[model samples]
Target chain A: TDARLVAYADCDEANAAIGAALALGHPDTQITDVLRQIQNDLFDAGADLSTPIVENPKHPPLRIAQSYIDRLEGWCDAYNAGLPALKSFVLPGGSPLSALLHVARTVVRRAERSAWAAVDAHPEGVSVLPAKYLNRLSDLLFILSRVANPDGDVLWRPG
Target chain B: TDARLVAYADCDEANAAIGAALALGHPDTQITDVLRQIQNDLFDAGADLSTPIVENPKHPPLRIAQSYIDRLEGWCDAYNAGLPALKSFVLPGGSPLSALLHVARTVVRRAERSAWAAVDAHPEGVSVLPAKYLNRLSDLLFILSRVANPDGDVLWRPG
Candidate 1:
């Protein structure tokens, strides 16, 4: 029950963050489209987390699909292909949209951690997909953050 | 030990998200200054969560100050003062800064949930201040999101 609560809260947070990202004007359609799809998947993930796996249930479970994770990796790679090679650690800034995307990326990372904690707490209760999906989602968001910034990423410099 | 890991991860995410929020230009100095302070306090809160209460310690235990929570409430009220009354639940999207603030707000909520779970898992090991501080911090972020948006919040309408 505790694990379920954590997963639900993390999913809810992720959904809200994604919605905020979508609200930004002049976003890349491909990025926004993938984010929207992730939102739908997060809802399904939440439902899957909330419901205990029942044997011989009337309906089959609706877990996150493996293809969703694969798709995120593909999108991430496509977005990264256009970005300049990083010479230094990327600072979380650039344009407003890019900064916001960084915010989303960090939140997704936290969600992944929470999902993993839930899984650790209950070995048999949750599927591995939630954690895997979030892991890929954060990476995709990081790439898209650079894509959102027309000028380029704000790289950290040694003070 | 497991609870400590969750708290550490939550704090790390909060720091990154807050950094992104700081990078957004045009934010009110007061808001950004307070956020900077909160980042420092989150570090303290993280340390407090990771370390168990002991009879004697090498250094004084770092915990969220009561003033911190009070200050967040005051800021939230100050920011909310300018915003229009809500007719419906606010959707996460608005201006880029607004969207980013919403992202920060949701992450704070997730952190709060994680902190509580840690407390629940180890009744005597963690301080209540981390959860309390985050609860207020999330509220402040929500109000700031509206303040950042030039067009005001996107109100959710029932379909």
Candidate 2:
């Protein structure tokens, strides 16, 4: 019944959708493999959130760690290396995979925002690492999206 | 600077991603055409949110009307007529279009939540209709996702 848990579940569900779309597109097996791995991470994060922060539980629940964020940062750097500096905001259309990732990026960002609200409500139980992982994951998705865009960035036109 | 406007923009951006995914999948031109029309509606809703609730401004800013929700409801009814009652909660994956629509549903729901926060902050300025529009849109999307699912609902398994 926790809003945070619901939000986390929604995040996992949305990521599953991205995995489904990737399967359908079949543009790149490597990217599909990578996204599938992240979906597993998202589910683990959800499991972490479901557990309470006990001093010494019988079994330590899976939790997001610095390594999760670190790996995401590494991927962000690797994917963004050759992308030109953003002069304008990128719209969410480009290569099909790019567009799919852009949607996933927003979904992750919204989940992060939801996680913070949960943190505010119950600081003792909610860990910051999950939110931090989500933040980094969105940043990584943005970079991955630009990498997928064959025609440079889809910069927004001021309308 | 309004979070509501930013969220609305994100919603539109996410929908655009769904459009791109649909285009790539090319499952149904009819659904594509329908979604394209809804994207236009989303833009108008965003524009409405951007403008202040002034007393009869010089030009009438476009706003979402009951008709938008009506059309979506009609679509929901049309699409759900043959769908079996849900026995378990649906997961995101099914068919490609169903998966894409499920993602879009979450984005729209998040935007609706954001819109309600804005309404709480500035009750007079933020109309309820935009949020209402988003609410119905998500409902419509859920039914449409079911419509697209050839394998019926992707029921969630107890983990």
Candidate 3:
């Protein structure tokens, strides 16, 4: 229950960040488009957690599809390909979109943790896809945050 | 004891971020200077928590000072004054320094929570200033993050 509760909060935070991105006028970008889809996916995730799976048949049980995770991986590769090799650790800010995406990134990690906790608590009850989905989503957000920042990532320098 | 644990973590994280900032070449910047002081203050905070005040004259306790909190407020106001009005919530990220500061900000918050919990557990054991110092430190981190980023803040926009 606490896992589900944390998941719900994560989703809400993600949604808020997405809304912020949209309000920032990023509707036409690939990043925002993906974020929009992610919002729907998160809803599906919430529903998936809320409803117990039907043993026999219930129209495919709205669990996240493998394709969704694959798509996220593809996106990460696509975006990360353009970024320079990491000479130093990246600091989360560069642009407004990047910052917001970073926020979403952290929240998504929390969601992943929540999903994993639920799965751990009830192996038979929870699907693994939700946690997997959130894991990829966090990575996607990180890469996308870099993409959003036109100036490039703020790389950390050691003292 | 738990509060000290978090405070120790807080100091370590702050020190790490400070190192990152220095590596990025912000040695003389106001934000870095304040952060350096904060690291020392966190150490003081840890010492304050680790050693309980004795009723007898064991010398004055090593609690955070009122001036420390006030300095943070002054810094916040000074940094925030240069930034734009909040049209939306700020997304962490704008520069490398900003992002790391944001990381520090969240950790400070967790430290604050731990301190509060310790206070709740033993009313006489904890000093209020540690929590209050952390509270202000978090705010300062947020503002400094913005200052570090020449690109300005990543303002959150709502739908």
Candidate 4:
């Protein structure tokens, strides 16, 4: 897949967590609308990157994989109601939903590395949005993971 | 139609300007690549708003208006190139591009108001990004107008 999909995948998790956080603080239509838009855009961003540039004449095209989209959509829906009641240091693999998002986050990291790789390789193909979006997405994923598995022990390392 | 579009438009512009400003000192292919992607996204953001949402499910849900996008894009482009060569205190009305962008600043204000309205209407719609985006967009426009008209004096009143 193109680097763009990785960015989108990253954004999907970020948007979901952000939306969930915001929803918890304030459950209003407009806020939900914005969250939904962000989620949708993250999905499109992945699609834009995944598709072959030749396949679409559109400059800023989407190239997301359906499997990725489904996973993200489900996460978003579950997160929409806000956090689930939980506590404990559970392993990374819990419910399929959480696992899917967690996996998406990992893919996003790979995508970020790939995008960076492209930048280093071609230099001319690096896009800031993709990187910035990915950075923010990763942050969102960590936040969501924290919220999702609140009881799970966060292994802090004294580096 | 929605305040989200307005907020997104301003955000797009600020992002474009930030990207341009960062690139000014480093005119590398990588920078250009990122800027071009952002430019294309901004254009799409503007175009998407112009289209009726019902007709385009593929249209990434917009969070900004065309006017706002136009204003930001025009100025960001100018700023990216260190503003157009100019030699007079030309009034804010001249070419359609300039006039429209000038009008866009006004629209941005309206859009900000609309965003605020949304928050008031649905107290949960508050995302710091919108405020940050609008605030930066206004600053970018002022800088752009000055840069665009280097010789022109910024007429202001001591209120």
Candidate 5:
């Protein structure tokens, strides 16, 4: 069993749930549109991770690009730049959309770590950019979650 | 850095979001109560995974028990046995809560994979049952997702 396969499967599983969340709720087409684009990007990312690097490949497969990370960073800045400065770690709660976004982000983090582990374990054909894309995308999701929660961030209380 | 720390952190991240979702929605206290217990188990799981076994150790830390998985199996049977035979793979949609639950399950799967990787990479003081607990927990989450999505399972469409 290839670790990358598990990584790739994680992408699909995470993607499906995000898609479901967006479809079942979140009336803002703008927000859903943004996530729709991300779903596409994630699919591309999974395809990229699925492909093994062949020395001489007859058919070139789609791979993640630096532009993917660039796009994610753009969104991250777009949402996060407007938010108040964080005083502490935020707990995942607020509006329904916000809570679901938080859930999606955590799942994205899992995928990110899995991708990194796969890259470390098998670097031959693995493009580091997919993991990088997942990293930036997770940050984007966090920012989006903050944007969705108008009730203010729920700061975690330390015991 | 201990891989277990990352694994443990994933647990907290995943758990927080699930708790948020249940709190913000899912009025069935019965369902939430079941998940609340799992959250506690997952916390125990994280604690267990966080501990490094030392030979002739003075302090005994919290660890995952087979009972954890057994309880999950009990729930799994309760939900899954009632569902009609699954003819195909289910898409991660139906109701909002179901979508969120599917999202949570995928995150659980990520935690499971991470725990296994940590165990494989660093066997010292690692308990295999934590990973096993995670495995069964994911299944329980899936079954619960099916139960929550009363509109019937969304069968995946093949290209």
Candidate 6:
């Protein structure tokens, strides 16, 4: 849970940065719109985690709703469909939307890593819906950034 | 805008209902914990909206900030708050979180209507924040109800 919270906090920070960038001078409307949608979707998924699910014979079991997954997939398709091939590693600070989204992608990865760590710690674990969702989200952000950037290069930091 | 969504919708009726059920019979906790903090805010003011400017300068502006003005002193408050208590409203039902949020939304609306009606009735006037917040909040409530109620409890009445 702590790990997940840290991940979410990272995402929150990135979300704020992206928002500020938009306000400052990012005129890429298309990227901004999609990024906002993804942010909202992340909020929705996070909210679902906070919400409780009652167990009853009459009541349906609670899980991640397919509608949210569908929305994520839709964004992924649109983002990837618009991208060109990845040549050499390019630098990250381009359009504000692109840069912020790149940050979001990294945050999502951190969240996924945290979730995996949690699962490793406790075999009797909760569903990985949040982790899986975050993973897909990172993919979407990467694709979106490339599509939005005219240069289309992400500077990969060598470990 | 994300903060705007929370100030308006995150604390809406449907979210309230869900919060209420989750509170597990504790009204205060429901109102204070889940309902108040879900939205973006600096200090978390779920308990009292009428608190005077005390000590917090870093307060995140309330979404329907103007509604507070109507609550303070406005004719719109007089009219809607004074509605003839004879008609039964149909917009009710949902999870505990959603239900509680609904109450907030209604209160928000009352605040808005009063603020708007005041401005409309008086040409040389200003109290637009509450009205705008209320209008947007109501819309957020409708959407939240749809999202929360997988059981389909929000019964719509046809005229």
Query: lDDT by residue for model 4 over A25-71, one digit each (tens)?
Result: 33246434434444554545544444434544557544334544455
What lDDT tens digits, residue by residue, belong to model 5 across residues B18-73?
Answer: 78558645738789889999899989988888887667566765889888889888
DockQ of each: 0.27, 0.15, 0.07, 0.01, 0.18, 0.02
Q: What's the CA RMSD for each of the models?
A: 6.8, 7.0, 10.1, 19.9, 6.6, 16.3
Order of quality (DockQ): 1, 5, 2, 3, 6, 4
Q: Tell me what fraction of the real C-alpha contacts between chains A and B each candidate also makes.
A: 0.48, 0.18, 0.00, 0.00, 0.23, 0.00
Error of 2 at A34 (Å): 10
> How well is each residue in B1-159 modelled by candidate 2, as lDDT tens digits?
686677567567656756754775565777777788788888888877776677985786688888887888887788789788899766565577777787677667767776676777678987788888888888888888888887776664433
Best model number under DockQ: 1
Model 1, B1-159: lDDT tens digits are 497778768887887778877785346787788778888988887887787877675787677778878988888888788778888766565676777777677777778887888889888877788889889988888888778776766664322
Task: State which docking tier applies to candidate 2.
Answer: incorrect
lDDT score of residue B35 within candidate 1: 79
Chain B TM-score of every predicted model: 0.92, 0.90, 0.86, 0.42, 0.92, 0.42
Name the DockQ score for candidate 4.
Answer: 0.01
Per-candidate iRMS values, in order, are 3.3, 3.7, 8.7, 19.8, 3.5, 16.8
Poorest lDDT segment (10 consecutive residues) of candidate 1 chain B? B150-159
Give one digit per residue, the lDDT tens place, for model 5 in A1-159.
Answer: 367878786787768657665845573877877887777777777888888777766776677889879988988888788899888999987887777777678768888887998899878768899899989878888888888887798898787
Question: What TM-score does structure 6 among the candidates reach?
Answer: 0.42
Give the worst 10-residue stretch by lDDT in candidate 5 chain A.
A18-27
TM-score of 3: 0.58
Over 4 Å off in model 1, which ranges? A1-4, A16-25, A28-159
Error of 3 at B7 (Å): 11
Candidate 2 residues lying further than 4 Å off, grouped into runs, are A1-6, A9-17, A25-117, A125-159, B27-29
What's the i-RMS for candidate 1 in angstroms? 3.3
Model 3 interface RMSD over true interface Cα atoms: 8.7
lDDT, candidates in the order shown: 0.77, 0.74, 0.69, 0.44, 0.78, 0.47
